[PDB]
Design a protein around this ligand. Structure first.
Ligand SMILES: Cc1cc2nc3c(=O)[nH]c(=O)nc-3n(C[C@H](O)[C@H](O)[C@H](O)COP(=O)(O)O)c2cc1C
Ligand SMILES: Cc1cc2nc3c(=O)[nH]c(=O)nc-3n(C[C@H](O)[C@H](O)[C@H](O)COP(=O)(O)O)c2cc1C
Ligand SMILES: [Cl-]
Ligand SMILES: [Cl-]
Ligand SMILES: [Cl-]
Lengths: 342, 343
């Protein structure tokens, strides 16, 4: 049984022709050994490669290509299973430099390939992490049926954001929100979470039921990095006033494509979505920057010092960890933010 | 001063090769008359075209191509302004059938072009409508600066949706929410509004300050169509229990693309977003399915019977509605009925 995969990647730094040639050599010898065939194209700092052969031999090779130093931002676009015929049966690995092709009849298809691929890499950034995951696994996300899954829902936004938008210039708000989004997205993804969307100044993400401790560590790391950043910059920098509240929930959610032909989107339906956003807002009245449900506590194996914060509106038990304790008074900080921006 | 555009589109069904030849035939006569050059390519049901020439002459042609019924789902991928040299100065319009090219050395580039373009069209389905607009207008969404704009914010969601998710199978709630999203998105777009995103069962949209009456008409039309739907279906259909509440606000919001190279999104930054979401939730406690601020009321010029619902803490703000938004039902009675029907 043979499979065929196609991926694109970003060329790491500047690779000269001899190192690219070095890839072609070692590829030809190894692919001949593993009976693997394919084509490698590169154009304007992007790699294009098609691989075909036995499933084990191809998947063994792709794991090694993933950890290669010479390219980054790897996305597998298509995986064809149970293929009957090779597409390039006489090319162990044919390397083609599309940059050096100056033939006039090939310029249209070469120009289109560059334009659509560069546009493709832009659209990838706006996708939910779940959509990129399905494409990477060779699954068309448009034909996946929605499923009831057990998810930890993550919500985090900016403290006193109404005051920040009221007093700061728009360009200064954008710099602050982009930095907040960058910190949250990097940490969530580092712990295996999946960012769903940005809603105003709010970051929505999900974790699996096996990632309870990772969800808590994500929340504490975001709080820790914001605390570091606030004393990194000067008092005239709006980042000096950046705080966050975080809420976590756990429950059954329907994940999949929702909408119509006018607008379809990756959506999460469930009570846990509403609950996580409510606990996120509840942190404003709590001496803790993180609040989560009993279900999230049940998903944790680490020895957290869980703190019961009573029942809140049916009514749900609210928990936190001792590490999430605020070294400040929330009301005084909101006053300090407004006073600083006066 | 010349510009160059490139777009992709879906070939409309039943389009014969003979019809394509007359496209290229007519294109050659008009583009040479207008000093327009470019290439038209098609592969596996998709059109690819590059157009270059003087700004107004290229624009005039593209508006005519936009309304051509021989293709749909047109996306202008890239626009280059003030180009120095034409890319195809000798081709008024060269038509290339990539389906007929079987040369072995072109096959890799041809196979990759189809794979990336088909993958691209899948990603477009998940893109925010505002970003698709920016790309069509030749604007780089990753570098364009967000702007402070005056917007009416729209928020609506499903009444007792927790009970619906608790008591219905997965395929049934998906059908129900898809029908709700379809009704809302069609009506919002029909009145000129822009659906921002779906947040669970909640629909977020925006209107301009000149669309105050359109936002109220959108809200009443959604409520009206759900009322029609409930008596169109049988009692065993979950759509028989579909109700909505709607909140509207007005204020300054920062609109633009936010995030990092790892994750981007289109968002609206402002107090008005939170206020509209709070007023939407307030409709559960009100005898009206629509609630909005005084700012929305000031954006209206039609002869609505505005009703003051008093001050409400979301400092408290005045909450308003229109007499048409009155509920013919008791809200708590309906939520208990939804729970008891699904028992
Ligand atoms: C874009 C790209 C494509 C590659 N394709 C192949 C390939 O098709 N076959 C192969 O053996 N190595 C390929 N490599 C190199 C492998 O990642 C790896 O470095 C090589 O197989 C060295 O094998 P070894 O370190 O296990 O001895 C590719 C590397 C890059 C950057
Ligand atoms: C994919 C596609 C590309 C087209 N490209 C051109 C073109 O480059 N130049 C042109 O004159 N017409 C082009 N047309 C046809 C025009 O849209 C239009 O049908 C034609 O110019 C008729 O002009 P008129 O009826 O307004 O006189 C294209 C049509 C399609 C479907
Ligand atoms: Cl702890
Ligand atoms: Cl925008
Ligand atoms: Cl009225």
């Amino acid at each position: 049984m043979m499979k065929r995969l196609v991926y694109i990647s970003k060329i790491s730094g500047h690779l000269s022709l001899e190192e690219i040639q070095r890839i072609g050599k070692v590829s030809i010898k190894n692919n001949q050994r593993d009976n693997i065939t394919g084509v490698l194209l590169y154009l304007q700092g992007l790699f294009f490669q098609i691989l075909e052969g036995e499933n084990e031999k191809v998947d063994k090779l792709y794991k090694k290509i993933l950890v290669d130093d010479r390219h980054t931002n790897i996305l597998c676009l298509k995986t064809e299973y149970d293929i009957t015929d090779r597409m390039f049966p006489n090319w162990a690995m044919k390397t083609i430099n599309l940059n050096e092709n100056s033939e006039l009849m090939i310029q249209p298809i070469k120009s289109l390939l560059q334009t659509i691929t560069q546009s493709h890499r832009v659209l990838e950034k706006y996708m939910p992490a779940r959509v990129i995951y399905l494409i990477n696994q060779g699954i068309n996300p448009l034909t996946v049926e929605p499923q009831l899954v057990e998810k930890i829902i993550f919500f985090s936004d900016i403290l006193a954001f109404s005051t920040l938008t009221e007093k700061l210039p728009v360009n200064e708000v954008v710099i602050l929100v982009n930095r907040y989004f960058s910190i949250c997205t990097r940490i969530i993804s580092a712990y295996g979470g999946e960012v769903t969307k940005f809603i105003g100044d709010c970051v929505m993400a999900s974790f699996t039921k096996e990632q309870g401790d990772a969800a808590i560590r994500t929340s504490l790391d975001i709080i820790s990095e914001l605390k570091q950043l606030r004393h990194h910059v000067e008092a005239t920098n709006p980042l000096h006033l950046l705080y966050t509240g975080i809420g976590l929930s756990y429950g059954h959610v329907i994940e999949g494509n929702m909408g119509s032909s006018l607008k379809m989107d990756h959506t999460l339906l469930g009570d846990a979505v509403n609950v996580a956003a409510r606990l996120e807002a509840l942190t404003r009245q709590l001496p803790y920057a993180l609040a989560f449900t009993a279900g999230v506590k049940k998903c944790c194996q680490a020895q957290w010092t869980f703190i019961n914060l009573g029942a809140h509106q049916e009514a749900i038990e609210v928990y936190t960890v001792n590490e999430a304790q605020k070294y400040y008074d929330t009301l005084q900080i909101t006053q300090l933010i407004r006073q600083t921006l006066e």
